Design a protein around this ligand. Structure first.
Ligand SMILES: Cn1nc([C@@H]2O[C@H](CO)[C@H](O)[C@H](n3cc(-c4ccc(Br)c(F)c4F)nn3)[C@H]2O)n(-c2cc(Cl)ccc2C(F)(F)F)c1=S
Ligand SMILES: [Mg+2]
Length: 138
């Protein structure tokens, strides 16, 4: 039981084989969730499940550089459900972030931001109740 928006410091940034686990419960009638892996003001990886974009559920991923959003990467496979407990796992790999939700693989997002050791904050926000936010090395 933690407050949303929540900031999780990633001391010294991220590194391959670093696994970030976020546990929580989606609120009933949710509109959006966002995970923002930040390098200062830039967003190295924005993971954004949208429950109602043109009456469809979509996961939108992007990068924000110098306050400009890049080319979006979209995924129609949508494992979240309003009112349900979830687990999101972000596994930092050499060339991409690998995302798995509720122990099932979801997507990969290739690194556009290369200074991994400077992505030192994960912002967690949106239509959820947050239970815990932590990391370990596998
Ligand atoms: C309908 N739409 N939405 C976007 C932006 O698309 C981005 C990904 O490409 C981010 O999702 C961004 N966004 C979302 C939030 C956000 C906040 C609060 C919570 Br709580 C939370 F969950 C959150 F997602 N803050 N910024 C969002 O505003 N764009 C978009 C897309 C691109 Cl490529 C470039 C520019 C834009 C923009 F200028 F129009 F914004 C459109 S078009
Ligand atoms: Mg339902």
């Amino acid at each position: 039981p933690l407050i949303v928006p929540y900031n999780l410091p990633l001391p010294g940034g991220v590194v391959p084989r670093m696994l970030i686990t976020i546990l929580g419960t989606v609120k009933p009638n949710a509109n959006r969730i966002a995970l923002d892996f930040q390098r200062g003001n830039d967003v190295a990886f924005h993971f954004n499940p949208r429950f109602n974009e043109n009456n469809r559920r979509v996961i939108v991923c992007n990068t924000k550089l110098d306050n400009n959003w890049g080319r979006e990467e979209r995924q129609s496979v949508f494992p979240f459900e309003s009112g349900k407990p979830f687990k999101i796992q972000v596994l930092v790999e050499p060339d991409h972030f690998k995302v798995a939700v509720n122990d099932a693989h979801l997507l990969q997002y290739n690194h556009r931001v290369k200074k991994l050791n400077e992505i030192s904050k994960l912002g967690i926000s949106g239509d959820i109740d947050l239970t815990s936010a932590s990391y370990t090395m596998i």
